[PDB]
Design a protein around this ligand. Structure first.
Ligand SMILES: O=c1ccn([C@@H]2O[C@H](COP(=O)(O)OP(=O)(O)O)[C@@H](O)[C@H]2O)c(=O)[nH]1
Ligand SMILES: O=c1ccn([C@@H]2O[C@H](COP(=O)(O)OP(=O)(O)O)[C@@H](O)[C@H]2O)c(=O)[nH]1
Lengths: 277, 277
């Protein structure tokens, strides 16, 4: 049903490069306070630059640590959200950063890799672009690998409301690649909703045959607090309900620490980047 | 908004007993393979029997361990699902057990306490019945206390679709009490959907003023596997969407262990026990 590559792809980098056929490739690393891991991520990919990869940027999303200086010292082009699109005031969240990154790149193909990876494989990018390069009509490639939000919230909600996407193992995965034509044609959900939004919109518009998923081997759970997962789940839900035509209250999740706190949720997507042309 | 008792209730057992005023109290312990903890739970409550508590049963939900013999050796009346209602074939899941327990009790008030508690407080039952006994119009009392499904799935979904219930700290809590009149008037969701179903139905029919929540002090996370949480979340979602008028696919969550497995979900509620009269 869904083109799934279960084992190590066999394509060599030179085959893949040859297969580009004039198409270009941009790589985007969104980054918010990832000073510990950003350089390792950049280094895993920079040997591809001027070859398979035509372009690499770090999309810095307001870091106040050493993310930017360290990315620069690893030879990466670093682009702030403001620089990506300076006529338009910056909103918080991941989705804003990824959407803005479209204005700061020009590749026919765009690859996203999270900047929080601990020793990422140097073949992530080649493995992700394979189906886009080699085939016809694949426009989106998702990764999978051996989380709580994914397995308790997103996958069960998909089974409930878009069971056709039940075969996708990591719908929330931060590692994926897509054609510019697709990406600039889709709205971008705010915050942590962006991946699930892109997947449902992609499916609704082109169906499964435009989607592939590739095995990246092994990944281990980021350690983050429960409360951040709470807010994340809320935004994933808001984005998922909206794509399925269901009205969301717009009310943020409240949590009680013995004290009460309400986290922000957003029901506002960014429009297709195409309108900004 | 929602009557919440944040500290230790001050009512003494003799006040509470006096406040019954001819009303009776049943206690139900649903149990599936809880041989390690069932006796401690029964013992925490049996000193109340023939006083505040008029009736205690263990609703045995198909145990194949020593649950039943150990409950009997602690002086509990043990009722199988079949015995609770023998003309009607037994379905799997928690909701079936709780629903059936209504036919095996006759208290004006029914208290549910999970049978998997590690050293439960002997005041759980007095604390839960307090608002039902002392006041007017409270028909349902939920507990709260210092889980993943609760905080990632149920609370965020309530915020999305029934934000009025956002102030409920433990919507999925297995410890609660209610009037028979209320309980026999509501359908019972299958599986792990039963608590969330009772809460939403209660709210929709009587509003918040009929609902209270009481502090039980401290509770610690049951250790159960992620996959069981996956199936649990799916059923909670199915029950929640249905109460909110949203169609659920009826498709079970699938998980990939490198091998694939699909877990059951049910879109079938039991009707109000009243129709069985
Ligand atoms: O407003 C944001 C939030 C996240 N990210 C980036 O998106 C990626 C995934 O975010 P996540 O919160 O999952 O990673 P974490 O913060 O736990 O390291 C990270 O590399 C972040 O640096 C970002 O650029 N802007
Ligand atoms: O089909 C079921 C499932 C659960 N329970 C009871 O409902 C309570 C809560 O179930 P849960 O799965 O949360 O507890 P666990 O199995 O982890 O001990 C337990 O005491 C169970 O014995 C039951 O009677 N029948």
């Amino acid at each position: 049903p869904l083109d799934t590559t279960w084992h190590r792809p066999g394509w060599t980098i030179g085959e893949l490069e040859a297969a580009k056929a004039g198409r270009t490739i941009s790589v985007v690393l969104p980054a918010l306070n990832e000073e510990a891991t950003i350089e390792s991520v950049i280094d895993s990919i920079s040997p591809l630059v001027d070859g398979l990869v035509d372009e690499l940027i770090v999309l810095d999303s307001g870091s106040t640590d050493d993310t930017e200086i360290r990315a620069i010292a690893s030879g990466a082009r670093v682009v702030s959200r403001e620089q990506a699109l300076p006529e338009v005031p910056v909103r918080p969240g991941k989705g804003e950063a990824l959407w803005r990154s479209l204005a700061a790149t020009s590749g026919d193909i765009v690859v996203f890799i999270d900047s929080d990876l601990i020793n990422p494989h140097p073949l992530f990018v080649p493995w992700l672009v394979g189906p886009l390069l080699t085939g016809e009509g694949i426009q989106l490639v998702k990764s999978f690998y051996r989380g709580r939000v994914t397995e308790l919230v997103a996958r069960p909600l998909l089974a409930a409301l878009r069971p056709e996407l039940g075969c996708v193992l990591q719908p929330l995965s931060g590692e994926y690649a897509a054609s510019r034509e697709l990406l600039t044609s889709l709205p971008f959900a705010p915050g942590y909703g962006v991946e699930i939004g892109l997947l449902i919109d992609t499916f609704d518009r082109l169906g499964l045959d435009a989607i592939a998923q590739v095995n990246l081997g092994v990944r281990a759970h980021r350690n983050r607090p429960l409360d951040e997962l709470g807010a994340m789940s809320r935004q994933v839900i808001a984005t998922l309900l909206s794509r399925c035509g269901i009205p969301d209250s717009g009310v943020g999740l409240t949590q009680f620490l013995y004290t009460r706190h309400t986290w922000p949720v957003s029901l506002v997507d960014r429009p297709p980047m195409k309108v900004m042309r």
